[PDB]
Design an enzyme around this catalytic site. Structure first.
Site, PDB file in Angstrom:
ATOM      1  N   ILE A   1     -22.052 -16.405 110.484  1.00  0.00           N
ATOM      2  CA  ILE A   1     -22.359 -17.332 111.567  1.00  0.00           C
ATOM      3  C   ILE A   1     -21.184 -17.423 112.547  1.00  0.00           C
ATOM      4  O   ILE A   1     -21.366 -17.243 113.751  1.00  0.00           O
ATOM      5  CB  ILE A   1     -22.779 -18.730 111.030  1.00  0.00           C
ATOM      6  CG1 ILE A   1     -24.242 -18.697 110.592  1.00  0.00           C
ATOM      7  CG2 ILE A   1     -22.569 -19.829 112.080  1.00  0.00           C
ATOM      8  CD1 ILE A   1     -24.689 -19.952 109.881  1.00  0.00           C
TER       9      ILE A   1
ATOM     10  N   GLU B   1     -16.421 -18.317 112.735  1.00  0.00           N
ATOM     11  CA  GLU B   1     -15.177 -18.781 112.132  1.00  0.00           C
ATOM     12  C   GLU B   1     -14.954 -20.249 112.429  1.00  0.00           C
ATOM     13  O   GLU B   1     -14.988 -20.673 113.583  1.00  0.00           O
ATOM     14  CB  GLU B   1     -13.985 -17.949 112.604  1.00  0.00           C
ATOM     15  CG  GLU B   1     -13.716 -16.702 111.764  1.00  0.00           C
ATOM     16  CD  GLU B   1     -13.320 -17.014 110.320  1.00  0.00           C
ATOM     17  OE1 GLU B   1     -12.804 -18.122 110.044  1.00  0.00           O
ATOM     18  OE2 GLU B   1     -13.527 -16.136 109.457  1.00  0.00           O
ATOM     19  N   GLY B   2     -14.726 -21.020 111.372  1.00  0.00           N
ATOM     20  CA  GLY B   2     -14.638 -22.467 111.473  1.00  0.00           C
ATOM     21  C   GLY B   2     -13.259 -23.031 111.238  1.00  0.00           C
ATOM     22  O   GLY B   2     -12.264 -22.306 111.293  1.00  0.00           O
ATOM     23  N   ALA B   3     -13.216 -24.337 110.975  1.00  0.00           N
ATOM     24  CA  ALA B   3     -11.968 -25.080 110.788  1.00  0.00           C
ATOM     25  C   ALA B   3     -11.432 -24.955 109.367  1.00  0.00           C
ATOM     26  O   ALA B   3     -10.264 -25.237 109.109  1.00  0.00           O
ATOM     27  CB  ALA B   3     -12.165 -26.545 111.150  1.00  0.00           C
TER      28      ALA B   3
ATOM     29  N   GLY C   1     -12.534 -22.087 107.488  1.00  0.00           N
ATOM     30  CA  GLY C   1     -12.599 -20.652 107.256  1.00  0.00           C
ATOM     31  C   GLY C   1     -13.930 -20.116 107.715  1.00  0.00           C
ATOM     32  O   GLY C   1     -14.522 -20.641 108.654  1.00  0.00           O
ATOM     33  N   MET C   2     -14.404 -19.078 107.039  1.00  0.00           N
ATOM     34  CA  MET C   2     -15.650 -18.418 107.400  1.00  0.00           C
ATOM     35  C   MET C   2     -16.870 -19.304 107.150  1.00  0.00           C
ATOM     36  O   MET C   2     -16.910 -20.069 106.180  1.00  0.00           O
ATOM     37  CB  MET C   2     -15.780 -17.105 106.631  1.00  0.00           C
ATOM     38  CG  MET C   2     -16.889 -16.197 107.126  1.00  0.00           C
ATOM     39  SD  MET C   2     -16.596 -14.479 106.682  1.00  0.00           S
ATOM     40  CE  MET C   2     -15.440 -13.972 107.948  1.00  0.00           C
ATOM     41  N   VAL C   3     -17.848 -19.202 108.049  1.00  0.00           N
ATOM     42  CA  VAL C   3     -19.139 -19.873 107.897  1.00  0.00           C
ATOM     43  C   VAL C   3     -20.254 -18.821 107.869  1.00  0.00           C
ATOM     44  O   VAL C   3     -20.283 -17.905 108.699  1.00  0.00           O
ATOM     45  CB  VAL C   3     -19.389 -20.916 109.019  1.00  0.00           C
ATOM     46  CG1 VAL C   3     -20.773 -21.556 108.873  1.00  0.00           C
ATOM     47  CG2 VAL C   3     -18.301 -21.987 109.012  1.00  0.00           C
TER      48      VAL C   3
ATOM     49  N   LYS D   1     -20.006 -22.964 104.046  1.00  0.00           N
ATOM     50  CA  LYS D   1     -18.606 -22.947 104.468  1.00  0.00           C
ATOM     51  C   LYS D   1     -17.702 -22.559 103.303  1.00  0.00           C
ATOM     52  O   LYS D   1     -17.757 -23.181 102.240  1.00  0.00           O
ATOM     53  CB  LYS D   1     -18.180 -24.323 104.973  1.00  0.00           C
ATOM     54  CG  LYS D   1     -18.912 -24.809 106.206  1.00  0.00           C
ATOM     55  CD  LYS D   1     -18.461 -26.221 106.579  1.00  0.00           C
ATOM     56  CE  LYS D   1     -18.805 -26.580 108.017  1.00  0.00           C
ATOM     57  NZ  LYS D   1     -20.223 -26.973 108.173  1.00  0.00           N
TER      58      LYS D   1
ATOM     59  N   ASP E   1     -12.237 -37.322 114.791  1.00  0.00           N
ATOM     60  CA  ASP E   1     -12.448 -35.993 115.367  1.00  0.00           C
ATOM     61  C   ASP E   1     -13.821 -35.830 116.018  1.00  0.00           C
ATOM     62  O   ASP E   1     -14.431 -34.762 115.952  1.00  0.00           O
ATOM     63  CB  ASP E   1     -12.209 -34.920 114.306  1.00  0.00           C
ATOM     64  CG  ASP E   1     -11.935 -33.549 114.904  1.00  0.00           C
ATOM     65  OD1 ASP E   1     -11.342 -33.474 116.012  1.00  0.00           O
ATOM     66  OD2 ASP E   1     -12.312 -32.542 114.256  1.00  0.00           O
TER      67      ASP E   1
HETATM   68  N1  LIG Z   1     -24.567 -26.848 109.275  1.00  0.00           N
HETATM   69  C1  LIG Z   1     -24.349 -25.754 110.015  1.00  0.00           C
HETATM   70  N2  LIG Z   1     -25.354 -24.883 110.259  1.00  0.00           N
HETATM   71  C2  LIG Z   1     -25.132 -23.778 111.009  1.00  0.00           C
HETATM   72  N3  LIG Z   1     -23.916 -23.503 111.535  1.00  0.00           N
HETATM   73  C3  LIG Z   1     -22.868 -24.338 111.322  1.00  0.00           C
HETATM   74  C4  LIG Z   1     -23.081 -25.493 110.544  1.00  0.00           C
HETATM   75  N4  LIG Z   1     -21.906 -26.151 110.482  1.00  0.00           N
HETATM   76  C5  LIG Z   1     -20.993 -25.450 111.181  1.00  0.00           C
HETATM   77  N5  LIG Z   1     -21.560 -24.340 111.705  1.00  0.00           N
HETATM   78  C6  LIG Z   1     -20.867 -23.336 112.524  1.00  0.00           C
HETATM   79  O1  LIG Z   1     -19.751 -22.796 111.794  1.00  0.00           O
HETATM   80  C7  LIG Z   1     -18.621 -22.602 112.670  1.00  0.00           C
HETATM   81  C8  LIG Z   1     -17.412 -23.498 112.327  1.00  0.00           C
HETATM   82  O2  LIG Z   1     -17.672 -24.508 111.335  1.00  0.00           O
HETATM   83  P1  LIG Z   1     -16.702 -25.819 111.645  1.00  0.00           P
HETATM   84  O3  LIG Z   1     -15.345 -25.519 111.173  1.00  0.00           O
HETATM   85  O4  LIG Z   1     -17.241 -27.153 110.830  1.00  0.00           O
HETATM   86  O5  LIG Z   1     -16.744 -26.157 113.266  1.00  0.00           O
HETATM   87  P2  LIG Z   1     -15.291 -26.782 113.762  1.00  0.00           P
HETATM   88  O6  LIG Z   1     -14.306 -25.688 113.870  1.00  0.00           O
HETATM   89  O7  LIG Z   1     -15.483 -27.493 115.243  1.00  0.00           O
HETATM   90  O8  LIG Z   1     -14.762 -27.945 112.705  1.00  0.00           O
HETATM   91  C9  LIG Z   1     -19.123 -22.916 114.078  1.00  0.00           C
HETATM   92  O9  LIG Z   1     -19.615 -21.720 114.692  1.00  0.00           O
HETATM   93  C10 LIG Z   1     -20.228 -23.934 113.784  1.00  0.00           C
HETATM   94  O10 LIG Z   1     -21.136 -24.074 114.879  1.00  0.00           O
END
Ligand SMILES: Nc1ncnc2c1ncn2[C@@H]1O[C@H](COP(=O)(O)OP(=O)(O)O)[C@@H](O)[C@H]1O
EC number: 2.7.11.24
Lengths: 347, 86
Positions: free
Chosen positions: A21, A23-25, A27-29, A44, A139
């Site tokens: 999906i 890269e998140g806060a 790690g990988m999503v 996550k 946040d």
């Molecule tokens: N419940 C979810 N369903 C689908 N995609 C998600 C979901 N939660 C997060 N994502 C996607 O995963 C990635 C990062 O996760 P996250 O770390 O929580 O966002 P952020 O970096 O703002 O904290 C982003 O592309 C976010 O849109």
């Protein structure tokens, strides 16, 4: 071990057919097919437990999300981790797969007044709950507000959340994980303590203004620049506005800046609803004591058609229990993480 | 080279012994016994401060909520498909 984009994503025999999906806060999503519930879910991966504040970030995210049951807050559906504590080097959080987030949405659409209204309501509806649990999100931003095209909104990521305590001394844990301060309350930015629930209202205010015009309201590049952006719109602070500032060296700094005039909201948002701006004006009040509270916002005339106190539930398991007092040995946090996640094992 | 020293002094003149304590707390994870200018020469000898390396103090002045300090660093770096709601 099923793995996506060169990284290990060991989500067991239950979750299969992985898709990257983003890269998140943490790690990988990924998205994955949940073979038990016959749907695609979001997963996550949260890894190295070798840094203390990262373990902190993980425990908060788990502990809080795991004891919240609200329509407008993303929930944890499953957690995968190794059976033994020594073997637990990473943790997978499994949530509802959401189609988009408000950041991605404002990036593409320009929203109708009707859409904004409903979204704002849901943010506040979810927030009323967060606050009644005695919790500060800290946040709140577009990217932390997950939607799907049915218009259902879910507030996410509670890794920076703390139990509401004005006596808490700021440690920089906040800026360690979030450098952007577009949605940061002015008092967070120049006090060092005394942060109240009204820091979250401020953020929502910023999110509202950004829904009206798609551009962020205070897009400051650096620390001093962010302050300048706020006074550029709100006008130089008043006699008692300044009295909100405990940090005398900060109070003097604001006073040393050249006078700025208030920009009337209708001049900044030419064709926004009049009821929308009157609410905004109260959410973006420099003075955190004058600033509108969540319960009162929901009762504002702009949300007239959605306001229903009987369908706005409060927390049953509030954080009075646990002042939470983290900031302690990292090995102990890992244990607490192992503990919290234990209710998802084969047992 | 020597103008960095001029505004190292400027910073040291504005750090009281009590501010010094709030500043070393902000340097959390990174020994206690230091007092004022000893802080700068600690950072320097751990490669956290140069004439050209200001990243760290800029950061610490923000965490310690000291715009007055940071403003001096800045100033003498500039010189040098949606469905309808119900
Ligand atoms: N419940 C979810 N369903 C689908 N995609 C998600 C979901 N939660 C997060 N994502 C996607 O995963 C990635 C990062 O996760 P996250 O770390 O929580 O966002 P952020 O970096 O703002 O904290 C982003 O592309 C976010 O849109």
């Amino acid at each position: 071990p099923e793995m996506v984009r060169g990284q290990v994503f060991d989500v067991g025999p239950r979750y299969t057919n992985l898709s990257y999906i983003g890269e998140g806060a943490y790690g990988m999503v990924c998205s994955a097919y949940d073979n038990v519930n016959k749907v695609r879910v979001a997963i996550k991966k949260i890894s190295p437990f070798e840094h203390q504040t990262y373990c902190q970030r993980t425990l908060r995210e788990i502990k809080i999300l795991l004891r919240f049951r609200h329509e407008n807050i993303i929930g944890i559906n499953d957690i995968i981790r190794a059976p033994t504590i020594e073997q637990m080097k990473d943790v997978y959080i499994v949530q509802d797969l959401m189609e988009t987030d408000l950041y991605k949405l404002l990036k593409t659409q320009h929203l109708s007044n009707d859409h904004i209204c409903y979204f704002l309501y849901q943010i506040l509806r979810g927030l009323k709950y967060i606050h009644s649990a005695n919790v500060l999100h800290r946040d709140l931003k577009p990217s932390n507000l997950l939607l799907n095209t049915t218009c259902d909104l879910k507030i996410c990521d509670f890794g920076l959340a703390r139990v509401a305590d004005p006596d808490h001394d700021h440690t920089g844990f906040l800026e360690e994980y979030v450098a952007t301060r577009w949605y940061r309350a002015p008092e967070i930015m120049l006090n060092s303590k005394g942060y109240t629930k009204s820091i979250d209202i401020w953020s929502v205010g910023c999110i509202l203004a950004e829904m009206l015009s798609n551009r962020p309201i205070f897009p400051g590049k650096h620390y001093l620049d962010q302050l300048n952006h706020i006074l550029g719109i709100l006008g130089s602070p008043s006699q008692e506005d300044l009295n909100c500032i405990i940090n005398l060296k900060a109070r003097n700094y604001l006073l040393s800046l050249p006078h700025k005039n208030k920009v009337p909201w209708n001049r900044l948002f030419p064709n926004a609803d009049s009821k929308a701006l009157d609410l905004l004006d109260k959410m973006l009040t420099f003075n955190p004591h004058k600033r509108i509270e969540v319960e009162q916002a929901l009762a504002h005339p702009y949300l007239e058609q959605y306001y229903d106190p009987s369908d706005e539930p409060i927390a049953e398991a509030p954080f009075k229990f646990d002042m939470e007092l983290d900031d302690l040995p990292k090995e102990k946090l890992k244990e607490l993480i192992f503990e919290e996640t234990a209710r998802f094992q084969p047992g | 080279m020597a103008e960095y020293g001029t505004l190292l002094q400027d910073l040291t003149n504005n750090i009281t012994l009590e501010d010094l304590e709030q500043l070393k707390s902000a340097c959390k994870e990174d020994e206690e016994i230091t007092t004022g200018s000893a802080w700068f020469s600690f950072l320097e000898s751990h490669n956290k401060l140069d004439k050209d390396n200001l990243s760290y103090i800029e950061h610490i002045f923000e965490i310690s909520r000291r715009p007055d300090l940071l403003t001096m660093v800045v100033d003498y770096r500039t010189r040098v498909k949606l469905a309808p709601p119900p």
